[PDB]
């Protein structure tokens, strides 16, 4: 149909376009590379072609698909690995003998090879149905049906034909819909453009616990179900590490991992590691992976795949939420997504803003976060779901004022830090309290108090300790440890202990084991207890030396507690933590008189 | 007086070290890094207007 | 057709529209000399070429253009070691010719097949600070961050030469079972540098071990960018077709980045942060993506890029970008160099986040990783104490701090201090490392698991 | 030929310019001003005209010279002051009654009044002769090697006409060469474009030093021919002195002095001073100037000549390298050559990189360093010659953290730190052992050990002693010198003699700033023997006061070492040092016992 007028860089101009929508997907040239229409100048439409071009001729054919860059939502997304332009990566390996994308491959959006078992819904013939309703379900996992087959949004009618229970393939018809005669047939998959968010019934308040399973978050600033999060940091920050832990431990029923332009070895590691390791609520065959789907993309792999990653992933997440699942979406990193834009603004010749990144940055990040939150699912059964977004970014040389980090921080309500100095001693991730806040902290403590722990009371003293520690440390540096008071010495020690035992997730035998809110609470009871009794003791006359040497064993025990597997009496209160409480009491008394 | 001098010299030896080692390179790194970012915003603008 | 005009490294051709992107063209000068270039931008009845070779002398209707009608691919053979080549797709040194059994593209996806399975095999440099504190794997990417007062070439050569002697000791251990190949590419460095490198490889072993691509600073920036691409084709073939582990030493990586910077200055392309391109991310990526295990899973390409920092800052765009992408960071310090430590590698900010992938356990200890973390932690405390020793004096520092100041001094002068040909096995390094840990008491070593400390002390 | 389309500033565009190369020398207008075509857009050539384009209407003719802008290489270089694109300043003084060249005044690069005596080589008609082979020579010097005439590089053939012995003019033909009909005629000079490096048989690394004749250069970190070196700027209260002294004291076969874009006080000083001063090896006929060829630009000269300045000088240096000579290129300053690039960029409209300096900067420096170095000279019986670049890089932002300095140091392997406080007090040179380095040390120290000196032992030890002295000096301030051993006091005592004699040399006296490379080694020998013996003797029972009285006469001699003559029987073995050694051994038995 159209004919290539020019290729200047990855940017292609082709005449004989009478139309085309925004960001319309095309297959360009005989090669059949990915593209999207960004703009139209005259009859000539400028289309960026984002798969590497080293050999596209002028006057090669241009085929419009007729709809924007879109995603399929349907059966077999779980335990199936995809790119950001929704090509199954497994399908490519077999055919192509190119494990990664080579230049010029056209592989359909889903797997049309794997038959799936369809069972019929509470909607039988003659019944009205509307988008996001559970028309049926597909068995995908050993424990649960993952993919609840939804009628798509922006479709409606009464069902003339319901296919019976049995096996069918993806392209075969299984549903016929009545509304102005045959409105159309439906297939197992449905399509949606990824620049349109999916519509919900209502959004609902975020105040319900999100257990990410990592001690350091639970202790300092927990997230919420419905959360939005920013995390900075630059290599040796433990972001890959916290993703793997996050996937294993996560209470959410789906986790969607987004690789924005990753090392490739990093993607190779996490893929291998989900079936090698076991889940905490049990998992039969590829345990963790059963709950994990990967969108993975490397650093030179298509600029479209990388740009679309956050939208392909957020659309997936919204679909699981409309299904009635709790989703934890990890994107890593939005900063690598931001580089895809920096590149897009130069090529096109549009004028950018500061740091050579465009101004449209701020809108695009904001749109992604607002589609997240906790909501009541669209569809007649009605369920509760969430999309809680944890989004990684990277500072430009210790500069946190770079447009990407500042923008994400603008939109977020939770900020979790990352300190370079503390990572060097091996404490990554490294969250303090002067580089981090959470608005959810206040409601979240109220909900944890209820469940069992004393957390809110301990949280306040814990915050104070860290806040004083920093200030007191500046005096040690400059003046020396000769200007201190004895209570201030106490604040320094307890603090050093907190730094190691929560923030560090680095091994010494084994990478640290699942620590819940309950575990995390016990650690806090022992550190806070140490501090109170010791200050009383010094106030009331007593040696510093006597008190520190005496705590001794108790300190070794809390350090290593996290390596030991949870439950050692109970999850709730361990016998190992219970006993220390007595030891402090016995010491306090010896010291006083 | 002699005991009094000994106590003061120690506070004084501490300060002479403190200024050189901590303060002076903290001022240097902050001034130069902000100078470099500040000039960048200004230069790119000229290039965009020109383009 | 004929040259229309020339504006810097960009050449304006008035031509006809049949050419494809990166299709080779040859510029015929009136001297009758041919130089090669590839079309960077094509439009109707015209082209913009960037010429690899030269950038001046280009005429109008006295000059002519001829089309090759093949977009650039590198002629790759597996008989490339020992053979001298020049960074231009052919030797202009008059060295043994390249030959071709495949011609492979440098776009960054020819047929590219990489890691679906992460590195697990340890590869040693014979140097303790590298191996123990960070570890190197059969796909690991580690940047050598160097300076204008450090001698970058001496360290570059040091790491490579000593990793060739260790690597067959590791073959016998059954860490490996396949060949070792070196691919050395020097791009746009001085003559003095180029000569030096070749001399170094000969002394240690031979130059049969390595393949050489030589590019001279007097040759353009456009040449310099193609120079690593040539290295990548060499390495991917060897891994793919003949199940060899390939080690690439890419010097200087900074040289390549400045080149990118030049084709946005004498282009109308608006640059990003600190005058470095906006599409700088993609240019760098191309080198780093083409790494990891190669299909069959006995072949590999492992990367050690060599960066020289000009300002020596960690706010400069080149060191920052590289670091996020690469699997490790090795920081080499001017202050150690001055003091008389060779190698003078500071591990204070050397970090790997893919620390697990980097270490080995089936041809290295399991204790290797546990000890390294503790060492790093104890080094760091020893640095905090060093600043405090200058300020406060010894007139208020604590009993615990004193152990940490001693550890710091013993650590620089024993662990990081090694002979020019003295190679240490990874197991022997543990014994050395255990000597360093041994002065601290069992209550200072509290962070480590009890099991390990009672076992090995 | 072409017709002027526009004159917008000093940039002039011209149409109807075909077969116009991209380095093409052109003469603009009726006046014939020098210009060169930087760019071409279409039919129109964009020219930077270096001279004032005042009086130039649109429609004036543009006449191609028909070839790039080249420089002439041949007889009658030495004892001439030149422009940045080689135009004799001296010749303008005769004609014009001007120092400088004013607009509309051009002249040829070599004088045609002067005639030189051409002597044939070892090739006669009918012989095949090859690129660079020695076709003849001219002798016009007796103090140094003269201008040996080569067959032009990249030129081969059989010689139809070899002119016999006699005087010919530089202009006049002396060769016709048969290579595809008459190849052309050639003359006594050859033209070479200066933005093209000259070939040589092969280039090698450096290994070969020569007489620097400034003690501090050799002693602290050796000075090598075929080297790359950075020297700090001072803007003529410190810069000028070291430059004048390096030209005068170094008895390198040639010296090529390039002032890139200087104050004009410094240019004025170097020209008047060179005939006035005496050679350090004997001979008259304007001593130092006869060895010197000068390119002298103040900042006032055209900007293309300032940019060109180093390129022309480097070609000059490279030409003499094929004759087999050792050259010092002393260039002052690269920051000022860099300033030209910045100016030329803004005029074109080129977008630069950091601090306003282009991106052509880093590659142009790398290309520049490599032209300089050691090489086996081209020409049939082969010789060795070298080109050593010492380039000053001054403040360009008021710091040394600016792009010009930081780029160069990296390619450079040598830094020599001038000291300001000592420089303001007029000790020149006074190089700081703290900041300085040479990466050439190793290969060189092995070279001198071969030749006859004990050089590796003494140089290394020189450095250690001084470094050590700063650290011991601090123990004297804070604890006291009285509580410290005799050994430590000695370490300092010796460092002060090493500092006084070498480092604090005065380039206003020739018995205090001119001594041969052997002589400089003999002085250093003297101090080291004393250090060891002094530490040996205090251990066997001596004191600082006792030691000082006892050494006496040898200590006084070492203090007086610099005042001594460059010879005593030979200028390579100074008999007074060899006998001093005996007096030291005899003194050590007496002192100790």
CA atoms of D323 and D435, how far apart (whole Å): 37
CB contact under 8 A, D478 and B13: yes
Please tell me whether A238 is known to bind a ligand.
Answer: yes
Q: How far is CA D490 from CA A457, D465, D473, in A?
A: 67, 10, 12
Nearest to A260 by CA among A314, A222, A205: A314
Which candidate in B7, B16, B47 is best for mutational testing of the C interface (most C CBs within 10 A)? B47
CA atoms of A122 and A135, how far apart (whole Å): 7
User: Is A474 at the interface with chain B, CB within 8 A?
Assistant: no
- Phi, psi values for residue A486, rounded to 5°: -70, -40
Partner residue opposite A356 with nearest CB, options B14, B44, B51: B44
Nearest to D153 by CA among D94, D90, D199: D199
Which chains have 3 or more CB–CB distances shorter than 8 Å to chain C? A, B, D
Chain B residues within 8 angstroms (CB to CB) of chain D: 13, 32, 39, 43, 47, 50
- C339 vs D contacts (CB less than 8 Å): none
- D366 vs C contacts (CB less than 8 Å): 188-190, 217, 255
Closest chain A residue by Cα to residue C374: A508
Q: Are C300 and C292 in contact (CB under 8 A)?
A: yes
With touching defined as 3+ CB pairs under 8 A, do chains A and D touch? no
Beta carbons within 10 angstroms of residue B33's beta carbon = 15
Nearest to C264 by CA among A347, D562, D189, D592: A347
Please tell me whether A239 is known to bind a ligand.
Answer: yes
- D410 vs C contacts (CB less than 8 Å): 147-148, 308, 310
Partner residue opposite C149 with nearest CB, options D204, D228, D437: D437
User: Is C192 at the interface with chain B, CB within 8 A?
Assistant: no
CA atoms of D94 and A500, how far apart (whole Å): 83
CA atoms of A468 and D265, how far apart (whole Å): 62
Which chains have 3 or more CB–CB distances shorter than 8 Å to chain D? B, C
User: Is C268 at the interface with chain D, CB within 8 A?
Assistant: yes
What's this structure's resolution in Å?
Answer: 7.6
First to last CA, chain D: 94
CB contact under 8 A, B22 and A478: yes
List all residues 6 or more positions away from D570 whose beta carbon is below 8 Å from its beta carbon. Answer: none
Angle (nearest 5°) at CA D426 between D263 and D434 = 95
CB pairs under 8 A between B and C: 29
Burial class (CB in 10 A: 0-12, 13-18, 19+), C140: buried
Interface of C with A in 388-407 (CB under 8 A): 388, 391-393, 395-398
DSSP letters, D394-418, are: --SSSSS-SHHHHHHHHH--EEEEE
Nearest to C146 by CA among C338, C350, C330, C415: C330
User: Is C376 at the interface with chain A, CB within 8 A?
Assistant: yes
DSSP letters, C57-70, are: ---SSSSEEEEEEE
- C446 vs A contacts (CB less than 8 Å): 555-556, 559
CB contact under 8 A, B17 and C271: no
Which chains have 3 or more CB–CB distances shorter than 8 Å to chain A? B, C
Interface of C with A in 433-452 (CB under 8 A): 443, 446-452
Please tell me whether A236 is known to bind a ligand.
Answer: yes
CB contact under 8 A, C271 and D353: yes
User: Is D531 at the interface with chain C, CB within 8 A?
Assistant: no
DSSP letters, D53-89, are: --S--TT-EEEEEEEE-EEEESSS-SS-EE-TT--BH
Nearest to A231 by CA among A337, A308, A333, A317: A333
Strands D190-193 and D70-73 turn out to be antiparallel
Angle (nearest 5°) at CA A68 between A67 and A71 = 105
Q: Are D138 and D119 in contact (CB under 8 A)?
A: yes
- B13 vs D contacts (CB less than 8 Å): 478
Q: Which residues of D are annotated as a binding site for ATP?
A: 233-240
CA atoms of A370 and A359, how far apart (whole Å): 19
Please tell me whether A240 is known to bind a ligand.
Answer: yes
User: Is C33 at the interface with chain D, CB within 8 A?
Assistant: no
- A91 vs C contacts (CB less than 8 Å): none
Q: Which residue has the tokens 């080549």?
A: C85
Interface of D with B in 318-377 (CB under 8 A): 349, 351, 355-356
- B41 vs D contacts (CB less than 8 Å): none
Closest chain C residue by Cα to residue D46: C7
Handedness of CA C254, C260, C266, C268 (dihedral sign): negative
Does a cis peptide bond (omega within 30 degrees of 0) precede residue D376? no
Distance from CA of D351 to the nearest CA of B (A): 7
CA atoms of A159 and A140, how far apart (whole Å): 25
Q: Are D501 and D551 in contact (CB under 8 A)?
A: no
Does a cis peptide bond (omega within 30 degrees of 0) precede residue D333? yes
Name beta bridge partners: C31. none
CB pairs under 8 A between A and C: 251
- D350 vs C contacts (CB less than 8 Å): 265-266
Any idea what DSSP says for residue D511? Answer: T
CB contact under 8 A, B44 and C271: yes
List all residues 6 or more positions away from D466 whose beta carbon is below 8 Å from its beta carbon. Answer: D433, D495, D498, D499
CB contact under 8 A, C449 and A300: no
List all residues 6 or more positions away from B4 whose beta carbon is below 8 Å from its beta carbon. Answer: none
Does a cis peptide bond (omega within 30 degrees of 0) precede residue C155? no
- C273 vs B contacts (CB less than 8 Å): 40
CB contact under 8 A, A399 and B37: yes
Q: Which residue has the tokens 């403190």?
A: B18
DSSP letters, A200-214, are: -SEEE---SB-----
First to last CA, chain A: 95
Interface of C with D in 236-265 (CB under 8 A): 255, 258-259, 261-262, 264-265
Which candidate in A15, A58, A361, A500 is best for mutational testing of the C interface (most C CBs within 10 A)? A58
CA atoms of D558 and D549, how far apart (whole Å): 15
Distance from CA of C143 to the nearest CA of D (A): 17
CB contact under 8 A, B13 and C387: no
Q: Is A563 helix (H, G, I), strand (E, B) or coil?
A: coil
Interface of A with C in 303-342 (CB under 8 A): 303, 336, 339-340, 342
- B13 vs C contacts (CB less than 8 Å): 393
CA atoms of D230 and D415, how far apart (whole Å): 5
Beta carbons within 10 angstroms of residue D320's beta carbon = 25
Structure tokens, A237: 């920050």
Partner residue opposite D351 with nearest CB, options B13, B32, B47: B47
User: Is A232 at the interface with chain C, CB within 8 A?
Assistant: no
Closest chain C residue by Cα to residue A237: C353
């Amino acid at each position: 149909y159209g004919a290539i007028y020019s290729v200047s860089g990855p940017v292609v101009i082709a005449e004989n376009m009478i139309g085309c929508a925004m960001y319309e997907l095309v297959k360009v040239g005989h090669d059949n590379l990915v593209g999207e229409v960004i703009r139209i100048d005259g009859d000539k439409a400028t289309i960026q072609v984002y798969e590497e071009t080293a050999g596209l001729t002028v006057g090669d054919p241009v085929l419009r698909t007729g709809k924007p860059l879109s995603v399929e939502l349907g059966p077999g997304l779980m335990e199936t690995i995809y790119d950001g332009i929704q090509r199954p990566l497994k399908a490519i390996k077999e055919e192509s003998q190119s494990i990664y994308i080579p230049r010029g491959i056209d592989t359909p959006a889903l797997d049309r090879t794997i038959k799936w078992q369809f069972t019929p819904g509470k909607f039988q013939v003659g019944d009205h149905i509307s988008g996001g309703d559970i028309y049926g379900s597909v068995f995908e996992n050993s424990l649960i049906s993952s993919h609840k087959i939804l009628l798509p949004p922006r479709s409606r009618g009464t069902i003339t034909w319901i296919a019976p229970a049995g096996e069918y393939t993806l392209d075969e018809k299984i549903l016929e819909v009545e509304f102005d005669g045959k409105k159309s047939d439906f297939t197992l998959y449905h399509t949606w453009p990824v620049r349109v968010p999916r519509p919900v019934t209502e959004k609902l308040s975020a105040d319900y616990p999100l257990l990410t399973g990592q001690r350091v978050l639970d202790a300092l600033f927990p997230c919420v179900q419905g959360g939005t999060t920013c995390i900075p940091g630059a290599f040796g920050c433990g972001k890959t590490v916290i993703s793997q832990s996050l996937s294993k431990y996560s209470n959410s029923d789906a986790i969607i991992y987004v690789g924005c332009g990753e090392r490739g070895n990093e993607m190779a590691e996490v893929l291998m590691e989900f079936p090698e390791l076991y889940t905490e609520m049990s998992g039969t065959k590829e345990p963790i992976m059963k709950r994990t789907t990967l969108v993975a993309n490397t650093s030179n792999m298509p600029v479209a795949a990388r740009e679309a990653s956050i939208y392909t992933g957020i659309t997936l997440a919204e679909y699981f939420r409309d299904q009635g699942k709790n989703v934890s979406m990890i994107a890593d990193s939005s900063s690598r997504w931001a580089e895809a834009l920096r590149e897009i603004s130069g090529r096109l010749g549009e004028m950018p803003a500061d740091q050579g990144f465009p101004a449209y940055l701020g809108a695009k990040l904001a749109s992604f976060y607002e589609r997240a939150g906790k909501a009541v699912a669209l569809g007649s059964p009605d369920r509760t779901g969430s999309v809680s977004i944890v989004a990684a970014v990277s500072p430009a040389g210790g500069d946190f004022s770079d447009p990407v980090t500042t923008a994400t921080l603008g939109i977020t309500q939770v900020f979790w830090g990352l300190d370079k100095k503390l990572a060097q001693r091996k404490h990554f991730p490294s969250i303090n309290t002067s580089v981090s806040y959470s608005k959810y902290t206040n409601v979240l403590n109220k909900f944890y108090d209820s469940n069992y722990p004393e957390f809110p009371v301990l949280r306040d003293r814990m915050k104070e300790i860290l806040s004083n520690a920093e200030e007191l440390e500046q005096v040690v540096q400059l003046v020396g440890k000769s200007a201190l008071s004895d209570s201030d010495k106490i604040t320094l020690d307890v603090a050093t202990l907190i730094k190691e035992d929560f923030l560090q997730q680095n091994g010494y035998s084994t990478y640290d084991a699942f620590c819940p809110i309950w575990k995390t609470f016990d650690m806090m009871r022992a550190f806070i207890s140490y501090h109170d009794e010791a200050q009383k003791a010094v106030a009331n006359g007593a040696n510093w030396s006597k008190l520190a040497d005496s705590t001794g064993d108790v300190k070794h025990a809390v350090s290593s507690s996290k390596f030991f597997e949870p439950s050692r009496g109970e999850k709730e209160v361990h016998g190992e933590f219970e006993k220390l409480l007595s030891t402090m009491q016995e010491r306090f008394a010896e010291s006083t008189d | 007086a002699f005991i009094i001098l000994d106590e003061v010299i120690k506070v004084t030896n501490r300060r002479v070290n403190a200024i050189e080692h901590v303060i002076i390179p903290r001022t240097e790194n902050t001034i130069a890094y902000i100078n470099s970012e500040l000039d960048e915003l200004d230069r790119e603008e000229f290039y965009r207007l020109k383009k | 057709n004929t040259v229309s005009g020339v504006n810097g490294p960009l050449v304006i051709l008035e031509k006809v529209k049949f050419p494809r992107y990166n299709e080779i063209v040859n510029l015929t000068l009136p001297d009758g000399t041919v130089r090669q270039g590839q079309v960077l931008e094509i439009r109707g009845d015209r082209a913009i070429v960037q010429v690899f070779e030269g950038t001046s002398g280009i005429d109008v209707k006295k000059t002519t253009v001829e089309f090759t009608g093949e977009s650039l691919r590198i002629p790759v053979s597996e008989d490339m070691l020992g053979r001298i080549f020049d960074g231009s797709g052919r030797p202009i040194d008059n060295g043994p010719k390249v030959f071709a059994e495949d011609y492979l593209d440098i776009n960054g996806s020819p047929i590219n097949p990489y890691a679906r399975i992460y590195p697990e095999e340890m590869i040693s440099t014979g140097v303790s600070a590298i191996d123990t504190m960070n570890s190197i794997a059969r796909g690991q990417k580690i940047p050598i961050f160097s300076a204008s007062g450090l001698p970058h070439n001496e360290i570059a050569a040091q790491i490579c030469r000593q990793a060739g002697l260790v690597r067959p000791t590791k073959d016998v251990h059954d860490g490996h079972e396949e060949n070792f190949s070196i691919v050395f590419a020097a791009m746009g460095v001085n003559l003095e540098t180029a000569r030096f490198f070749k001399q170094d490889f000969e002394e240690n072993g031979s130059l049969e071990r390595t393949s050489l691509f030589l590019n001279l600073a007097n040759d353009p920036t456009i040449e310099r960018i193609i120079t690593p691409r040539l290295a990548l084709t060499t390495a991917e073939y060897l891994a793919y077709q003949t199940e060899r582990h390939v080690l690439t030493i890419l010097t200087d990586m900074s040289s390549y980045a400045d080149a990118l910077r030049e084709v946005s200055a004498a282009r109308e392309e608006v640059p990003g942060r600190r005058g470095y391109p906006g599409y700088m991310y993609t240019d760098l990526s191309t080198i780093y993506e083409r790494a990891g295990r190669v299909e069959g899973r006995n072949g590999s390409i492992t990367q050690i890029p060599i960066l020289t920092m000009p300002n020596d800052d960690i706010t400069h765009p080149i060191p920052d970008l590289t670091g996020y992408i690469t699997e490790g960071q090795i920081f080499v310090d001017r202050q150690l160099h001055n003091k008389g430590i060779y190698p003078p590698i500071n591990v204070l900010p050397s970090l790997s986040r893919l620390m697990k992938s980097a270490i080995g356990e089936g041809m290295t200890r399991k204790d290797h990783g546990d000890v390294s973390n503790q060492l790093y932690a104890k080094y760091a405390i020893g640095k905090d104490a060093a600043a405090m020793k200058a300020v406060v004096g010894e007139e208020a520092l604590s009993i615990e701090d004193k152990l940490s100041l001693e550890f710091l001094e013993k650590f620089e002068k024993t662990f990081i201090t090694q002979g020019a040909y003295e190679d240490r096995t990874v197991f022997e390094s543990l014994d050395q490392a255990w000597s360093l840990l041994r002065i601290y008491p069992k209550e200072m070593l509290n962070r480590i698991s009890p099991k390990i400390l009672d076992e090995f002390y």
